[PDB]
Amino acid sequence: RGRLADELSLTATVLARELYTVGYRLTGQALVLSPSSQGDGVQGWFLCEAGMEEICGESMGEVRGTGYEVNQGALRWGACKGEGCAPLPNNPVLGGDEVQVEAFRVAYLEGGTWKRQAQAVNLRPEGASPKVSALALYLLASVPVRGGAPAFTPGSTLSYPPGLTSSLLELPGAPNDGRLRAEKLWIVQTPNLA
Amino acid sequence: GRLADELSLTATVLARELYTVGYRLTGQALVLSPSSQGDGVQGWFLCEAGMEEICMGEVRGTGYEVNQGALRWGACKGEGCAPLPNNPVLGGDEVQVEAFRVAYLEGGTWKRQAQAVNLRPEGASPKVSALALYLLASVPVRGGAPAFTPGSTLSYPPGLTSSLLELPGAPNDGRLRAEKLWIVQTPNLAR
C-alpha cells in the first residue's frame, strides 16, 4: 500500500492485460524484446477478434501492434495497426515528472530458463520459435516525500519465481537522495507464444 | 501531472474491463446504479480461453463503486454472481476519490438513470452504444492549490452535460484536484 505502490499496481494491470494477448491467432513476428542499460523496450503483435479488446474496436480480423519503452524517467506506450507495424511510443503511462521511473526491465521464460537479452519470437504454423511461456516485468519508481524516506534497496520487496534473480534483471542501485521508492515485479503468462 | 496520470491509468483499467461486458452473453449484462452521492456499475461476460489470464466457457462479473474515498473493484464467477467491490483501484488515503459517475448512450441520447441491459439472441434491450465515465480526485500539495470547479476541464460529447452527470462542487480546502471524463464503446451491448 502507499500511493506510489497503488500506481505501480495500476500500471502492471494495464501492461499485463495488453501483453497476455501477444501472439493471439498470429502468424509471423509476435514479440520483440530490446533490453538495454537505459531501460527495456517491448513490442508485440496480435490478431484482433471483435468484442474482446477495446483497441481492436475497428480492427476485426486485423493485426495490431503494441509497444512500451522508458525515456527520460517516463514509461510510454504506443499502438499501431498492420502486420509488422512499428508502434510509436508517445503516450504517457507513468512518470516523467514528480514520479520518476528509474528502471523498467523485461525478462522472458524459455523452457524453464529465465533470460534477458535481445529476442524476437516468430509464430509459424509448425509452432513458436523460440517457445516463450512468460514475461517478467519490473518497475522501480521514486517520488519526493517531506522529511525523506530511508534508503531503499531495489529487489528487497520482490517475490521471485523459480529461477529468476536480481542479477538477471540488472536492478540498479538507488541514489542517496532521500526520495520515496517503490518497486513492482509481475509475471505475465504468454500462452500464445508457447 | 502525477494525479492526472493516475486518473488516466484508472480509466484504462476500467475501460478495458467494461468494453468486454456482454461478450457472448445471454441474459443480464449490465446494471447501472447512479446516485447524486456516487454511481455503481456492474457487468457480466463470458470468458473465452486466451482472452484473459483470469479466465473457459464460464460467466464472470465485474463491478465498480466508490467507498470511503477509494474507487474499488470486485469480481465474481458464475451466472448472476454479485461482484462485491472489495479491492481499492485508486484512492482511500493520500488520494481521495470524490466522485465517480457513469452515463450511457442509447440511440444518440446520453442518459443517466437506473438501468439494466439484457441480451437476447435477437439482440440487446435497451441498445447501449457507449458508456461515459467520470472521476474526480484530490490530493494534498505543499503550498495549496487554487479552488477547482468540477466539469471545468472536460470535453463533452454533444448532449452530455455536468447537470446530467450530477457533478459535485469542490470545497475550497487547498487540495489539488483533477478530473477525467472518458468514453468506452460497448459494442457487445449494441448488437
Q: Which residue has the cell 439472441?
A: B121
Rounded to whole angstroms, how far apart are CA atoms A4 and A94? 11
Using the Cβ of A57 and the Cβ atoms of chain B, whether some distance falls under 8 Å is answered with yes
Distance, first Cα to last Cα, chain B: 38
User: How many CA atoms are closer than 13 Å to the CA of B84, on its beta-carbon side?
Assistant: 1
In the DSSP assignment, the letter for residue B13 is: H
The residues near A112 (Cβ < 8 Å, ≥ 6 apart) are A163
Closest CA to B138 of B90, B102, B182, B85: B90
Q: Largest Cα–Cα distance in chain A?
A: 59
C-alpha cell at B111: 442518459
**Which resolution, in Å, applies to this structure?**
1.9
Using the Cβ of B62 and the Cβ atoms of chain A, whether some distance falls under 8 Å is answered with no
Neighbours of A104 (CB within 10 A): 28
Neighbours of B45 (CB within 10 A): 26
Using the Cβ of A125 and the Cβ atoms of chain B, whether some distance falls under 8 Å is answered with no
Q: Of A1, A9, A10, A68, which to mutate for an interface test with B (greatest number of B Cβ within 10 Å)? A: A10
In the DSSP assignment, the letter for residue B189 is: G
* Domain that includes residue B132, residue range: 1-191
Q: Do B53 and A143 touch (CB under 8 A)?
A: no
CB-CB neighbors (< 8 A) of A3 in chain B: 93-95, 139
How many residues does the structure list for chain B?
191
CB–CB of A34/A118 below 8 Å? yes
Closest CA to A161 of A117, A120, A119, A107: A107
Please give the method by which this entry was determined.
X-ray
Return the residue of B nearest to A16 by Cα. B53
Cα dist from B1 to A98, A147, B136, B139, B171, whole Å: 8, 22, 14, 12, 21
Domain count within chain A = 1
Crossing angle of helices B2-19 and A3-20, rounded to 10°: 40
Neighbours of B2 (CB within 10 A): 21
* Beta sheet of A132-143, edge-to-edge order: A113-115, A100-110, A132-143, A180-189
Chain breaks in chain A (C to N over 2.5 A) after: none
Rounded to whole angstroms, how far apart are CA atoms A55 and A23? 15
- Spell out the alpha helix ranges (H) of chain B: 2-19, 162-165
- From the list A17, A93, A98, the residue facing B2 with the nearest CB is A98
User: How many CA atoms are closer than 13 Å to the CA of B85, on its beta-carbon side?
Assistant: 18
Using the Cβ of B191 and the Cβ atoms of chain A, whether some distance falls under 8 Å is answered with no
Q: Which residue has the cell 439484457?
A: B118
HEC secondary structure over chain A: CCHHHHHHHHHHHHHHHHHHCCCCCCCEEEEEEECCCCCCEEEEEEECCCCCCHHHHHCCCCEEEEEEEEECCEEEEEEEECCCCCCCCCEEEEECCCCEEEEEEEEEEECCEEECCCEEEEEECCEEECCEEEEEEEEEEEECCCCCCCCCCCCCCCCCCCCCCHHHHCCCCCCCCCCEEEEEEEEEECHHHC
Burial of A22: CB neighbours in 10 Å, binned 0-12, 13-18, 19+: buried
Three-class SS of residue B54?
A: coil
How many CB pairs below 8 Å do chains A and B form together? Answer: 71
